[PDB]
Design an enzyme around this catalytic site. Structure first.
Site, PDB file in Angstrom:
ATOM      1  N   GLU A 137      -3.303  13.439   1.663  1.00  0.00           N
ATOM      2  CA  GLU A 137      -4.501  12.850   2.495  1.00  0.00           C
ATOM      3  C   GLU A 137      -5.050  14.133   3.214  1.00  0.00           C
ATOM      4  OE1 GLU A 137      -3.130   9.364   4.735  1.00  0.00           O
ATOM      5  OE2 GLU A 137      -4.202   8.538   3.052  1.00  0.00           O
ATOM      6  N   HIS A 183       2.180   9.026   0.921  1.00  0.00           N
ATOM      7  CA  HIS A 183       0.987   8.874  -0.036  1.00  0.00           C
ATOM      8  C   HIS A 183       1.310   9.575  -1.175  1.00  0.00           C
ATOM      9  CE1 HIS A 183      -1.177   6.779   3.454  1.00  0.00           C
ATOM     10  NE2 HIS A 183      -0.316   7.571   4.108  1.00  0.00           N
ATOM     11  N   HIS A 241       4.390  10.938   5.958  1.00  0.00           N
ATOM     12  CA  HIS A 241       3.847  10.744   7.492  1.00  0.00           C
ATOM     13  C   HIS A 241       5.152   9.943   8.159  1.00  0.00           C
ATOM     14  CE1 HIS A 241      -0.557  10.316   6.168  1.00  0.00           C
ATOM     15  NE2 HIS A 241      -0.058  11.536   6.439  1.00  0.00           N
ATOM     16  N   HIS A 255       6.813   6.801   5.676  1.00  0.00           N
ATOM     17  CA  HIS A 255       5.960   6.267   4.557  1.00  0.00           C
ATOM     18  C   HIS A 255       5.351   7.494   3.734  1.00  0.00           C
ATOM     19  CE1 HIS A 255       2.558   5.954   7.353  1.00  0.00           C
ATOM     20  NE2 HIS A 255       1.820   6.465   6.259  1.00  0.00           N
ATOM     21  N   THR A 302      -4.981   6.560   8.652  1.00  0.00           N
ATOM     22  CA  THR A 302      -5.651   6.643   7.534  1.00  0.00           C
ATOM     23  C   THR A 302      -5.717   5.481   6.728  1.00  0.00           C
ATOM     24  OG1 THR A 302      -3.649   7.252   6.081  1.00  0.00           O
ATOM     25  CG2 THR A 302      -4.755   9.134   7.410  1.00  0.00           C
ATOM     26  N   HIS A 332       0.840  -1.211   0.004  1.00  0.00           N
ATOM     27  CA  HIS A 332      -0.113  -0.085  -0.089  1.00  0.00           C
ATOM     28  C   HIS A 332       0.708   1.263   0.172  1.00  0.00           C
ATOM     29  CE1 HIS A 332       0.389   0.009   4.421  1.00  0.00           C
ATOM     30  NE2 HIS A 332       0.459  -1.332   4.365  1.00  0.00           N
TER      31      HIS A 332
HETATM   32  N1  LIG Z   1      -0.978   6.509   7.395  1.00  0.00           N
HETATM   33  S1  LIG Z   1      -0.813   6.803   8.897  1.00  0.00           S
HETATM   34  O1  LIG Z   1      -2.415   7.157   9.538  1.00  0.00           O
HETATM   35  O2  LIG Z   1       0.646   7.711   9.052  1.00  0.00           O
HETATM   36  C1  LIG Z   1      -0.598   5.035   9.704  1.00  0.00           C
HETATM   37  C2  LIG Z   1       0.374   5.124  10.632  1.00  0.00           C
HETATM   38  C3  LIG Z   1       0.566   4.006  11.496  1.00  0.00           C
HETATM   39  C4  LIG Z   1      -0.009   2.982  11.030  1.00  0.00           C
HETATM   40  O3  LIG Z   1       0.443   1.555  11.455  1.00  0.00           O
HETATM   41  C5  LIG Z   1      -0.822   2.860  10.038  1.00  0.00           C
HETATM   42  N2  LIG Z   1      -1.856   1.920   9.455  1.00  0.00           N
HETATM   43  C6  LIG Z   1      -0.863   0.579   8.960  1.00  0.00           C
HETATM   44  O4  LIG Z   1       0.258   0.513   8.766  1.00  0.00           O
HETATM   45  N3  LIG Z   1      -1.797  -0.643   8.492  1.00  0.00           N
HETATM   46  C7  LIG Z   1      -1.108  -1.801   7.851  1.00  0.00           C
HETATM   47  C8  LIG Z   1      -2.102  -3.009   7.577  1.00  0.00           C
HETATM   48  C9  LIG Z   1      -2.635  -3.494   8.974  1.00  0.00           C
HETATM   49  C10 LIG Z   1      -4.051  -3.584   8.992  1.00  0.00           C
HETATM   50  O5  LIG Z   1      -4.592  -4.673   9.476  1.00  0.00           O
HETATM   51  C11 LIG Z   1      -1.226   4.120   9.321  1.00  0.00           C
HETATM   52 ZN   LIG Z   2       0.156   7.628   6.026  1.00  0.00          ZN
END
Ligand SMILES: NS(=O)(=O)c1ccc(O)c(NC(=O)NCCCCO)c1
Ligand SMILES: [Zn+2]
Length: 257
Positions: A103, A93, A116, A91, A195, A61
């Site tokens: 975002e 977007h 982020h 990471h 997000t 993703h």
């Molecule tokens: N974009 S963010 O708000 O900075 C953000 C910061 C830290 C996070 O851990 C996530 N979410 C994530 O990494 N999900 C991975 C798939 C597992 C779900 O089952 C999003």
């Molecule tokens: Zn993010």
């Protein structure tokens, strides 16, 4: 599996993650005239001098750079935060075109990308516990616009060809995240969520007012990554952003007049 396509994208996520329709979801549109200056907000303290990057990974993703978070090496403090938050990963977007990709939006304006930097509150001991708390994470969000190159981004850009497809990772030691920050640390802040799934409502968002500039060649390399794994039909990793969500009963605060 959730994603960003027509049949598994953000409009579908609530079916597996019903908090998607919750009271403090992210991202949001930042209405700059409605945000309130809060003079009690402290300056941000970014202490990245001892950061230890480990790996860079395509997770299907986005791509992320992971850090050693077993000691207070790279921490975020101050601002709206109580206590110390350790940097875990960063990471991005981004979009298929320069007019979309962020975002958060600012007066409905979308930037070409958003960085982020993800931190967790050390009082909770590990990130898995922190995500279950309303003040568990702090994410520093930085907008990217297309113009002049960002020299501190080039080491990331040059390794992306080695992690083209989902699941690929590479050693990525000695990267200095200070090279990704703009000059000013003026910011907006509000309580929100992850997000991406699981969309947990655990984040204090800190969104910097000043974007960084990256070159068209730099962002084009982001757009050559793949959502798919090796040996699968190729789907370019573009438009991996969630749209703005309802602000509901929240106020955005500004650190600056
Ligand atoms: N974009 S963010 O708000 O900075 C953000 C910061 C830290 C996070 O851990 C996530 N979410 C994530 O990494 N999900 C991975 C798939 C597992 C779900 O089952 C999003
Ligand atoms: Zn993010």
């Amino acid at each position: 599996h959730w994603g960003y396509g027509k049949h598994n994208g953000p409009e579908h996520w609530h079916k597996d993650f019903p908090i998607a329709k919750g009271e403090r979801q992210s991202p949001v549109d930042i209405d700059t005239h409605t945000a309130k200056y809060d003079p009690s907000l402290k300056p941000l303290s970014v202490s990245y001098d001892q950061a230890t990057s480990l790996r860079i990974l395509n997770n299907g993703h986005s791509f992320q750079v992971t850090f050693d978070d077993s000691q207070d090496k790279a921490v975020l403090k101050g601002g709206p935060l109580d206590g110390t938050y350790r940097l875990l990963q960063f990471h991005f977007h981004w979009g298929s075109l320069d007019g979309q990709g962020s975002e958060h939006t600012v007066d409905k304006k979308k930037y070409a990308a958003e960085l982020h930097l993800v931190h967790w509150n050390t009082k909770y001991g590990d990130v898995g516990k922190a995500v279950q708390q309303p003040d568990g994470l702090a994410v520093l969000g930085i907008f990217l616009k297309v113009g002049s190159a960002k020299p501190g981004l080039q080491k990331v850009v040059d390794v992306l060809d080695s992690i083209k497809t989902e699941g690929k990772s590479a050693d990525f030691t000695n990267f200095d995240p200070r090279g990704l920050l703009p000059e000013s640390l003026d910011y907006w802040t509000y309580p929100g969520s992850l997000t991406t799934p699981p969309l947990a409502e655990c984040v204090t968002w800190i969104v910097l007012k000043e974007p960084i500039s990256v070159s068209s060649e730099q962002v084009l390399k982001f757009r050559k990554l793949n959502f798919n794994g090796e040996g699968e039909p190729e789907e370019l990793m573009v438009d991996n952003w969630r749209p703005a969500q309802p602000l509901k009963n929240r106020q955005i605060k500004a650190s600056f007049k």
